Write a protein that binds this ligand. Structure first.
Ligand SMILES: Nc1nc2c(ncn2[C@@H]2O[C@H](COP(=O)(O)OP(=O)(O)OP(=O)(O)O)[C@@H](O)[C@H]2O)c(=O)[nH]1
Ligand SMILES: [Mg+2]
Length: 664
């Protein structure tokens, strides 16, 4: 039922994706690569002392701090939700093979009994009202670009000057390119303005993944991660196979001469896609103003900063339901892309812009290297973008796409199962807009706090409260999916955007508190996704610019965890056993070095200014800017710190661009 066309790298269609420069040519050909990450300066993830430390610490913490999660997935007591074995991976060595990305998710959705469009007219009005509220009265802002980020297809440039030129040119030529696509001239739009082509598939590490200790055998078992072979990916699952990837690390001894201690595994690998920058720039120019609107006008539902900021909202609720979505990005529906596009056209958005946006969500994918002697294949034809991959991670508005889908999905779930008395308030578009505007501001008896696939659903006192409890019970029973749109369940150990909701004996939101997840501290400190990149001179371009700074924000971030002190003491004791050194002193030295190095990057910071004016968010972000892509936003970071990590195209160029996109 329609296989996607596939082209080898040798084919002209794949060759056209890579410009005549060394960087682009190397990206096309990049073979499967693996190796130990430089966890910290002069320390490898596979260092025998480091692995010995991880073995002792993971075993000790699991033993002394067993999970405290009730029958309803509510965290209590110690604030622990699982064992601590997730740290037991040979960081930098992936599971083999990684998945081939699914070219079509239509069969995947149908087989999971998920809808191929809005079920009812009410749902249709709500998805459309979400578009009207999110995209209406936007204000132009500079187009911000992450320093050291790639332009991907076709140039693969990491230079800021080149990136600024590409972005400015893209805003100037977006109209001409969009109009060519409207005429079906995709190859022309790509050849002239580099708008089209494909997403470039990079495989990123998920450094920690589930591991259990079998009491019967005393042997560790890693969570099986299902992967699709080429045949399965091109046929959308009609043909080929879905099988467990190999996380067995035994191979490292034979291949590399690395000693593999018992119960250490290869890392889970996730597909990540880099968009063609010329196509992304005009999308980003609209996406940022949308985020600014939703994080201001609809801050209740969408703007999440601190554990206390989240706590203030949740404490007012009579019931809090922490939801879980199965494989959000791969299940994301193409019918929603089409509904959004149709609604933007109805609002009066430039048709050429809507076409660029639509095309960004149908684009072919270039598969690099999922395993040795595999990959280097383009899936889909760039001459006619028609893929149904779900949500591409490198699309200019992925966060908004997931947020739009999920916010409405959860509201529908609350309406269907708890609040039929509110259905009368949604009769047409104006009434749907008025209702959603009120709901998103937290003004209804049914409420929510969400970001993409993470959410907490709330009920205050009223008619919907009883229904709220039945819905929670249906989730606990786990026999019926409460949504027609996505696979929803309850989170086992309810958390929101990294903060665990810690309940007491009462098991009520009013007496529950948000605390930092101590397991995330361990993930970040001992299992970073990337190495220190000590060879990259410009620290602002590194994936981990100032790792030492995280020590200064630790107490602020994790201090509220019941076992915070216990974990720090266990780390100190285990690090002494493994290295014969103080971990605290080691981190204090790294903090000093990185504080000194930071002043070189901040114009306002005198040669030895100190961390005085910096917030805990600023420190966490400087140590890990990936937190700025999933946890926080630009407005949460001090202006002088945002400038370290980002650079922008003038608001004058974006202001002119935005005027041409937006309705009259
Ligand atoms: N701290 C941190 N979090 C990450 C990182 N990468 C991804 N995440 C989070 O990982 C989550 C992924 O949820 P999934 O694993 O796909 O859910 P699933 O497909 O149903 O599989 P399960 O893990 O069994 O639930 C997302 O919500 C991400 O934000 C990272 O590098 N660091
Ligand atoms: Mg959650």
């Amino acid at each position: 039922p329609r296989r996607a066309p596939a082209f080898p790298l040798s084919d002209i269609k794949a060759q056209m994706l890579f410009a005549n420069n060394i960087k682009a040519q190397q990206a096309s050909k990049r073979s499967f690569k693996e190796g130990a990450i430089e966890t910290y300066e002069g320390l490898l993830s596979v260092d025998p002392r480091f692995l010995s430390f991880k073995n002792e610490l993971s075993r000790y913490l699991t033993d002394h701090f067993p999970a405290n999660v009730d029958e309803y997935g509510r965290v209590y007591g110690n604030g622990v939700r699982t064992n601590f074995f997730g740290m037991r991976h040979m960081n930098g060595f992936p599971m083999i093979p990684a998945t081939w990305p699914l070219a079509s998710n239509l069969k995947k959705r149908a087989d999971a009994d998920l809808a191929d469009g809005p079920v009812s007219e009410r749902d249709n009005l709500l998805f459309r009202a979400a578009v009207r509220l999110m995209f209406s009265d936007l204000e132009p802002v500079p187009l911000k670009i992450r320093k050291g980020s790639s332009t991907c297809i076709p140039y693969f440039s990491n230079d800021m000057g080149t990136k600024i030129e590409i972005a400015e040119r893209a805003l100037e030529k977006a109209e001409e390119a969009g109009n060519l696509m409207l005429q079906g001239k995709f190859d022309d739009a790509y050849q002239l303005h580099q708008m089209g082509g494909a997403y470039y598939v990079v495989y990123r590490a998920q450094s920690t993944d589930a591991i259990t200790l079998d009491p019967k055998t005393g042997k560790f078992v890693s969570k099986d991660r299902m992967v699709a072979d080429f045949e399965y990916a091109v046929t959308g699952g009609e043909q080929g196979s879905l099988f467990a990837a190999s996380k067995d690390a035994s191979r490292l001894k034979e291949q590399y001469g690395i000693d593999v201690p018992d119960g250490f595994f290869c890392e889970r690998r996730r597909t990540a896609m880099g968009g063609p920058f010329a196509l992304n720039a005009p999308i980003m120019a609209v996406a940022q103003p949308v985020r600014n609107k939703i994080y201001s006008k609809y801050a209740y539902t969408f703007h999440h900063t601190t554990r206390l900021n989240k706590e203030e909202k949740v404490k007012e609720w009579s019931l809090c339901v922490a939801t879980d979505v199965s494989d959000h990005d791969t299940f994301w529906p193409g019918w929603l892309r089409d509904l959004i596009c149709d609604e933007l056209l109805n609002m009066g958005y430039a048709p050429w812009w809507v076409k660029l946006f639509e095309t960004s969500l149908k684009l072919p994918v270039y598969v690099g290297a999922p395993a040795p002697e595999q990959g280097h294949t383009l899936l889909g034809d760039p001459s006619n973008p028609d893929l149904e991959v779900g949500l591409s991670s490198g699309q200019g508005a992925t966060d908004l796409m997931g947020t739009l889908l999920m916010s409405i999905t959860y509201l529908v779930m609350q309406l269907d199962h708890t609040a039929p008395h509110l259905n009368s308030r949604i009769k047409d578009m104006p009434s749907a807009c008025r209702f959603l505007d009120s709901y998103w501001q937290g003004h209804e008896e049914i409420r929510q706090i969400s970001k993409s696939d993470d959410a907490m659903l709330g009920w205050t006192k009223g008619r919907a409260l009883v229904g709220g409890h039945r819905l929670f019970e249906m989730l606990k029973e786990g026999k019926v999916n409460p949504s027609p749109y996505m696979k929803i369940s309850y989170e086992h150990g309810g958390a929101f955007l990294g903060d665990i909701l810690l309940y007491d004996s009462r098991r009520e939101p009013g007496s529950a508190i948000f605390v930092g997840n101590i397991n995330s501290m361990l993930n970040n400190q001992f299992s970073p996704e990337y190495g220190v990149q000590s060879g990259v001179r410009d620290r602002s371009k590194r994936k981990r610019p100032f790792p030492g700074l995280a020590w200064a924000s630790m107490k602020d971030t994790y201090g509220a965890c019941p076992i915070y002190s216990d974990v720090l003491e266990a780390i100190e004791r285990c690090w002494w056993n493994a290295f014969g050194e103080s971990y605290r002193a080691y981190r204090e030295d790294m903090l000093k070095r990185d504080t000194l190095e930071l002043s070189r990057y901040v114009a306002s910071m005198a040669r030895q200014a100190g961390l005085a004016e910096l917030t805990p968010i600023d420190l966490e972000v400087l140590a890990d800017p990936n937190k700025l892509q999933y946890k926080w936003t630009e407005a949460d970071v001090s202006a002088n710190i945002h400038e370290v990590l980002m650079h922008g195209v003038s608001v004058e160029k974006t202001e002119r661009f935005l005027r041409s996109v937006m309705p009259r």
